[PDB]
Amino acid sequence: RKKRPEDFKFGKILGEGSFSTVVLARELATSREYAIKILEKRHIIKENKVPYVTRERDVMSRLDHPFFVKLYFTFQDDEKLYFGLSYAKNGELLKYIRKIGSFDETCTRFYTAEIVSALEYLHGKGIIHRDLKPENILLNEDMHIQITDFGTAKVLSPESKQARANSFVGTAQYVSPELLTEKSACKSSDLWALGCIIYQLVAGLPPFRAGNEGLIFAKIIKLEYDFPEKFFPKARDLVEKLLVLDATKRLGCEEMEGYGPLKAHPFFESVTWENLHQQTPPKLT
């Protein structure tokens, strides 16, 4: 039942990471297209990356929602590891922020709403992402989001009612103050990253930025940031309710059933939440 490399015709390289190459592939027997992420066992072993490979598989195996890249299958051979993933034809959200410079209110609202919807699902499964950022929000052919990069995600244990996770992972611009100061992250840490992303969609850069990670950390823990002129006022209010140092006071932490109160923020008044993945996204310009 396991697939094999010879079951596919490989095409163009879609991208490369420090430990991986993602290649477009067609499955010969079905003609379906997949993005196949390929890792070298020897390199994974040397760089102490084995647990991250199995974590990526295990976490993605739990997910089945329209706003996440889907893992269809895994396989291996003597030298390589392979993940068969849904192909996000339009690549990274980051590319669009850089090219256009920022998003208008309608586009900011729409994409923010999809990310909220996605996080409601993920956190509902007791999973925290921990590295949410525009590079990890891919876009499918229809321009809906496809969140990726789960090797540094964490499944919180239901059995122990686990709320906090202890591994130090993330990206400096988006890392939460609690991870820096208390050395733990929780679901709310992903809400901090969301606040940074919303700011970035509007302002064109994330709110804590510097040419050195240490300089960024110092600003995060002091909540040292400012809004530009013209920043959509309801978006500013929302960001101010997410970029809160006390992780227990970020909008969405009211209850554990959903993100009802966050969805109810005035920034989202015109949003129809139920069928977001079937709506036509607004054009990015």
Ligand SMILES: Nc1ncnc2c1ncn2[C@@H]1O[C@H](COP(=O)(O)OP(=O)(O)OP(=O)(O)O)[C@@H](O)[C@H]1O
């Ligand atoms: N399902 C996919 N569809 C289309 N492109 C993808 C897909 N998954 C990854 N990519 C692109 O492939 C590249 C490599 O992704 P991968 O997860 O292998 O490493 P990464 O997270 O970018 O690197 P690092 O491990 O160094 O952080 C990225 O540019 C990503 O945008």
Ligand SMILES: O=C(C[C@@H](c1ccccc1)C(C(=O)O)C(=O)O)c1ccc(Cl)cc1
């Ligand atoms: O997790 C697996 C194998 C696993 C695997 C995980 C992720 C990607 C490919 C294979 C595989 C299996 O357990 O049968 C599978 O799921 O088919 C693995 C990880 C690192 C190294 Cl160096 C070797 C193996």
Ligand SMILES: [Mg+2]
């Ligand atoms: Mg990534």
Ligand SMILES: [Mg+2]
């Ligand atoms: Mg990755």
